[PDB]
Structure 1
Amino acid sequence: MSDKNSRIAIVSADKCKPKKCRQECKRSCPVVKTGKLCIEVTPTSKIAFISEILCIGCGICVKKCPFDAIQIINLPTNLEAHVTHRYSANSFKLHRLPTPRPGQVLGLVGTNGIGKSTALKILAGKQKPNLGRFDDPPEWQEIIKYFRGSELQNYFTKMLEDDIKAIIKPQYVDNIPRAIKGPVQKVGELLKLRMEKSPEDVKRYIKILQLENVLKRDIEKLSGGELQRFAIGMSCVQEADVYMFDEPSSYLDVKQRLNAAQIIRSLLAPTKYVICVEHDLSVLDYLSDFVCIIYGVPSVYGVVTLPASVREGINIFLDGHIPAENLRFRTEALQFRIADATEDLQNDSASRAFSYPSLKKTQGDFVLNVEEGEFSDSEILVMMGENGTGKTTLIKLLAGALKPDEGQDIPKLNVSMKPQKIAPKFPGTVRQLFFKKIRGQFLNPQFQTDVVKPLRIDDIIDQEVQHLSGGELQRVAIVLALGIPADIYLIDEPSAYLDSEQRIICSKVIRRFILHNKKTAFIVEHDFIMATYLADKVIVFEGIPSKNAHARAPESLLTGCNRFLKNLNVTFRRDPNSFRPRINKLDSQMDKEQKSSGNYFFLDNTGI
């Protein structure tokens, strides 16, 4: 009959100060003018509350709000059907959950804030869903009822009985070091205690993960990649049926992430149920039998789809649209420059730019070797390889931060540098920090599109850096490097802590400015997609991690990608509809043919 619609109000308390404009929401609102209930003022907490029943959907309150604290949306009653859990009034609410299946791996992919982490907790038995209502400390009985008609119903009965206790590898990567310590109780101690499997289990898992060096080090001491892998080890070592992984690719390098994926899949063989959440598509494809996609606006809502297949789910993800849901989850589709697309220019050749000679940097524990290479103007070079290879070391030497043991690089160039792991260590607020760097760049329209508008830094401006978040801080750092003028810019691993949309904003940023400005940039990365878009040449690193390493001169996109991918031995085809790289299995039918041709990738992409 009539169209079915709803209104949902979510307000962010961080953004709201009702002293500032007085309580302007209660006034202003036409519902309240009549004497209705749409917005009620909470006198104890001093927060405005908007009731969804009485609200008109007018949106008058939204544009009145001096910050942008209130958000009213109108949905066709898509969310109402699905309600799983709600944090509180006017807060994040979760919709649907991912199915678990024995003997298989089920994937999850989505943008941050969707409730991927929350979903894991509910499945874990850590949190009890309220069901968008009263549902108390684990009143699991009601949860089963809500899930009826879904395959999770059987799972919730199992969980309540405590027949199975799921093992969880914790999500937040930044949080782990502070929580766990063990200089004495290093990594080795944890692996010994947890090993329910065999004494072989300790050895086998350590070898495949490339943990051998790290056992002696303590947990707090570990680097990001090392920290992640230890968690993985415990999740194999444990005896249980259900192994939940939440973002296992985080911090890891390209070689290691693939390794993690294979080992985790081994659980499926013992017929143990596995669940996993990933931001990386290469890794996600490899692990999963089934895939769920989580979509919706960040921090407002996030719904889980029906289970799908591995290929199908990935294909649908890339279009940016889901048909049943009928939502354009992403505003713009992702595309990579063909390399036909790029501008044709004559580049500074001859002494294009500066050149570096052979370089060596030796710690006495690790040795880096570099081959003389050349850099030209207005180009960009990708740096790839596994961590511990001295990818980080090389960039620092060029920065002038590090002194080479051998070789010399004294350029008369101004360098801007962006560090790999970002930890605050700066007193002051976010805005102040940006402003010292450059005020003018904050004015430009491009910076509005990429930084300011999406995150809402305006709210962030007063907040402290210590108080801040991981991914938010990352986009800020990348932009800041770009803040100041320099002949050459250096960035180290921009993809960390970022979801799909966030990385891709970065890809466009580096390529566009470098082209306009006619300056050079070196970017290190693990994400294959990012490298393709930005670069014109690449340097590949090889050797053995935590031991020795080597670097190469810059070489063309096609040439460099063949070398890199040859090292992994996994080829990528193309999906004809989505135009994504389709992981071709080794011994894929196609794998053999592609290797013969010497083509690891298709539809090679280059800088714009």
Structure 2
Amino acid sequence: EEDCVHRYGVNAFVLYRLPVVKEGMVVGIVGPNGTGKSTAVKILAGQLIPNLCGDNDSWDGVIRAFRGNELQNYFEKLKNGEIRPVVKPQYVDLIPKAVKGKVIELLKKADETGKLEEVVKALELENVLEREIQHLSGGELQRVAIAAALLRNATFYFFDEPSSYLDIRQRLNAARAIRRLSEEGKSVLVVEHDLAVLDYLSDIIHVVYGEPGVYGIFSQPKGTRNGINEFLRGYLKDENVRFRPYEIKFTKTGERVEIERETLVTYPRLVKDYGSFRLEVEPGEIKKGEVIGIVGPNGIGKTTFVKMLAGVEEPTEGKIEWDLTVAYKPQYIKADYEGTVYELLSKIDASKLNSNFYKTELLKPLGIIDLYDREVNELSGGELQRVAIAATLLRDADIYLLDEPSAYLDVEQRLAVSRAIRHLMEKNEKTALVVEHDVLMIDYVSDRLMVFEGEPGKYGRALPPMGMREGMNRFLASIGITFRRDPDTGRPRANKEGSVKDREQKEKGEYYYIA
């Protein structure tokens, strides 16, 4: 194999092949972290001269090395400066330590297209313009970075993981704004871990596979549907590569309705006031042995609702009268345990750690066994997320509450967590409520849905748990995106704006198919 593009050093990480870039199209990239996705972006953006796994140190070398490839001309243009790709960086948290002043100052400066007013609208930046960069949240930094990139005038735009820190509405609206670039004839390359967003965004897909931290390989370009389906199946036909020993199928959105579950508990109208913000919860019922997905933009009260159910927060009005044990995986986790992951988890339930079912369905797929000897206080955000999810699912309780388990996880880890939640809840016949912004995770794990509506920071309303179709129709109408079903894998499939299916579904008010 002589498709070696870059080696980080002796025994360091090596990248094989590169994705294609095409004007007028969106090329999506999907794969586990540590496999070279950002490295390819750096190379194509001109930020890193690939050494071709040798000593190459010039663009001329790359130009000769890519003879016979459509990228030869690309690199010629890159070296000559006829193109200067715009890059929305992955590590938006580092923006402050390099930029100062008001957001409106950063954006006016990036504005080379006179679309400031439009981009601000799309990314909900109206109240961030006057804010200083130093006071921005990870979420606001992400949206400001996507806006800066969208405002530039160039031919090539590369977005590295734009959905991180964005709520469900924000990530789908940013995807619409990003895709518009290709409609204007520009070329877009986007790396994404949220499969629904990746789907809606892309015309072409590359799957990246390999061994995290050791090597990564870009697949041949694939049509959007075929690429995402091969990814779920764990097997790339043409390349004849099986990167996962099993398939992840989504077929199972119908049986989760034909079964009369008993009621676990009911809760009455609840109100939680935080100064000027107010959350009103409509009376609801929770069934034994079901999973309720919870969706809604942020700053609306999802976490506040979960906290009241977990008993960590008290309602201002209304009273919950339960005699249930609850296991709770909080949205923001702070490691504070002097001991290893194994010590922490073995103290929760050692019998489950030694259980074949738990090792197969939870510990191995989430990579927990490989973290057993790690000190909890030294875990990264993604490692801590997996360990906290496992810690929560290892507890013995009537109800399990998981507040945003997909944050910090890569696409493969998300699929592993979706399966773990579903399989363990089915096994233990218990109940869970899961707040999530990742549509395919919601789809995979949920039997019913609770939708939150309101004005972020001002007021929120928790609608009672309803069917998947009714809840997604309610949420999606607010965003103008429709999903149908893909028979091959059973996954929800995004319709491009204006397509035949999109028009048909919108006219009928059926924004989300299951059947």
Q: TM-score, normalised by structure 1?
A: 0.77
The 5 A counterparts of 1:8-27 are: none
Stretches of structure 2 lacking an aligned partner (at least 5 in a row): none
1:539 is aligned to 2:457:
no
**Maintained 8 Å contact 1:451/1:476:** no
1:83 is aligned to 2:1:
no
Looking at structure 2, the residues matched to 179 and 447 of structure 1 have their Cα atoms a distance apart, in angstroms, of 43
C-alpha RMSD of the superposition: 2.8
CA shift at 1:129, angstroms?
1.4
CA shift at 1:180, angstroms?
5.3
Give the alignment partner of residue 152 of structure 2, picking from 229, 238, 250.
238
**3-state DSSP class of the match of 2:146?**
helix
1:265 is aligned to 2:186:
no
- Encode CA deviations 1:204-263: one digit per residue, 9 max, x unaligned: 221211122333444454444323111101112334433211011122222111110121
The structure number with the bigger radius of gyration is 1
The 5 A counterparts of 1:164-243 are: 164-172=83-91, 175-176=93-94, 179=97, 185-198=101-114, 201-219=115-133, 221-243=135-157
Distance 1:384 1:230, change over 3 A: same
Looking at structure 2, the residues matched to 347 and 371 of structure 1 have their Cα atoms a distance apart, in angstroms, of 21
| Residue number in structure 1 paired with 2:50 | 129
1:141 is aligned to 2:60:
yes
**3-state DSSP class of the match of 1:381?**
strand
1:331 is aligned to 2:250:
no
**3-state DSSP class of the match of 2:493?**
coil
Give the alignment partner of residue 476 of structure 2, picking from 565, 568, 577.
565
Mean alpha-carbon deviation: is it higher for 335-344 or for 101-110?
335-344
Looking at structure 1, the residues matched to 205 and 89 of structure 2 have their Cα atoms a distance apart, in angstroms, of 20
The 5 A counterparts of 1:575-586 are: 575-586=486-497
**3-state DSSP class of the match of 1:582?**
strand
- Encode CA deviations 1:136-185: one digit per residue, 9 max, x unaligned: xx322221222222111112222223343333222135x53774575xx3
**3-state DSSP class of the match of 1:480?**
helix
**Maintained 8 Å contact 1:430/1:464:** yes
Distance 1:342 1:202, change over 3 A: closer
Looking at structure 2, the residues matched to 371 and 343 of structure 1 have their Cα atoms a distance apart, in angstroms, of 23
Looking at structure 2, the residues matched to 440 and 380 of structure 1 have their Cα atoms a distance apart, in angstroms, of 25
1:446 is aligned to 2:357:
yes
2:86 maps to a residue whose letter is I
Give the alignment partner of residue 392 of structure 2, picking from 481, 488, 508.
481
| Residue number in structure 1 paired with 2:15 | 94
Looking at structure 2, the residues matched to 262 and 235 of structure 1 have their Cα atoms a distance apart, in angstroms, of 14
Mean alpha-carbon deviation: is it higher for 385-394 or for 540-549?
540-549
Give the alignment partner of residue 302 of structure 1, picking from 196, 212, 216.
216
Looking at structure 2, the residues matched to 568 and 272 of structure 1 have their Cα atoms a distance apart, in angstroms, of 24
**Maintained 8 Å contact 2:449/2:471:** yes
| Residue number in structure 2 paired with 1:360 | 271
CA shift at 1:450, angstroms?
4.6
CA shift at 1:285, angstroms?
3.0
- Encode CA deviations 1:432-485: one digit per residue, 9 max, x unaligned: 333443333322223323554356555534444454333222211111112222
Mean alpha-carbon deviation: is it higher for 533-542 or for 289-298?
289-298
1:161 is aligned to 2:80:
yes
Identity rate, percent: 48
Q: TM-score, normalised by structure 2?
A: 0.90
Mean alpha-carbon deviation: is it higher for 584-593 or for 537-546?
584-593
Looking at structure 2, the residues matched to 466 and 144 of structure 1 have their Cα atoms a distance apart, in angstroms, of 46
CA shift at 1:592, angstroms?
3.9
1:469 maps to a residue whose letter is S
**Maintained 8 Å contact 2:256/2:447:** no
Distance 1:304 1:467, change over 3 A: same
CA shift at 1:582, angstroms?
2.9
**3-state DSSP class of the match of 2:207?**
strand
**Maintained 8 Å contact 1:121/1:127:** yes
1:357 maps to a residue whose letter is P
Give the alignment partner of residue 331 of structure 2, picking from 414, 420, 427.
420
- Encode CA deviations 1:294-320: one digit per residue, 9 max, x unaligned: 223333332223334334433443443
**3-state DSSP class of the match of 1:256?**
helix
**3-state DSSP class of the match of 1:422?**
coil
CA shift at 1:396, angstroms?
1.2
CA shift at 1:490, angstroms?
0.8
- Encode CA deviations 1:1-53: one digit per residue, 9 max, x unaligned: xxxxxxxxxxxxxxxxxxxxxxxxxxxxxxxxxxxxxxxxxxxxxxxxxxxxx
Looking at structure 2, the residues matched to 560 and 203 of structure 1 have their Cα atoms a distance apart, in angstroms, of 32
| Residue number in structure 2 paired with 1:72 | none
| Residue number in structure 1 paired with 2:295 | 384
Looking at structure 2, the residues matched to 443 and 177 of structure 1 have their Cα atoms a distance apart, in angstroms, of 45
CA shift at 1:498, angstroms?
2.1
- Encode CA deviations 1:53-82: one digit per residue, 9 max, x unaligned: xxxxxxxxxxxxxxxxxxxxxxxxxxx131
| Residue number in structure 2 paired with 1:47 | none
| Residue number in structure 2 paired with 1:37 | none
2:81 maps to a residue whose letter is D
**Maintained 8 Å contact 1:507/1:534:** yes
**Maintained 8 Å contact 2:196/2:438:** no
Looking at structure 1, the residues matched to 345 and 367 of structure 2 have their Cα atoms a distance apart, in angstroms, of 14
**Maintained 8 Å contact 1:103/1:268:** yes
Looking at structure 1, the residues matched to 507 and 156 of structure 2 have their Cα atoms a distance apart, in angstroms, of 41
Stretches of structure 1 lacking an aligned partner (at least 5 in a row): 1-79
Higher RCO, 1 or 2 (CA under 8 Å, sep at least 6)?
Answer: 2
The 5 A counterparts of 1:491-502 are: 491-502=402-413
CA shift at 1:564, angstroms?
2.8
2:75 maps to a residue whose letter is F
Give the alignment partner of residue 34 of structure 2, picking from 96, 99, 113.
113
Distance 1:533 1:457, change over 3 A: closer
**3-state DSSP class of the match of 2:190?**
strand
- Encode CA deviations 1:311-360: one digit per residue, 9 max, x unaligned: 44334434432222111122211112525555976533xxx322222122
**Maintained 8 Å contact 1:180/1:220:** no
| Residue number in structure 2 paired with 1:248 | 162
Give the alignment partner of residue 401 of structure 2, picking from 480, 485, 490.
490
CA shift at 1:403, angstroms?
2.5
Distance 1:345 1:359, change over 3 A: same
Give the alignment partner of residue 556 of structure 1, picking from 467, 473, 497.
467
**Maintained 8 Å contact 2:103/2:133:** yes
Distance 1:220 1:480, change over 3 A: farther
The 5 A counterparts of 1:332-347 are: 332-339=246-253, 341=255, 347=261
**3-state DSSP class of the match of 2:333?**
coil
**Maintained 8 Å contact 1:451/1:475:** no
Looking at structure 1, the residues matched to 183 and 512 of structure 2 have their Cα atoms a distance apart, in angstroms, of 30
**3-state DSSP class of the match of 2:206?**
strand
**Maintained 8 Å contact 1:108/1:292:** yes
Distance 1:290 1:346, change over 3 A: closer
Distance 1:452 1:555, change over 3 A: closer
**3-state DSSP class of the match of 1:570?**
coil
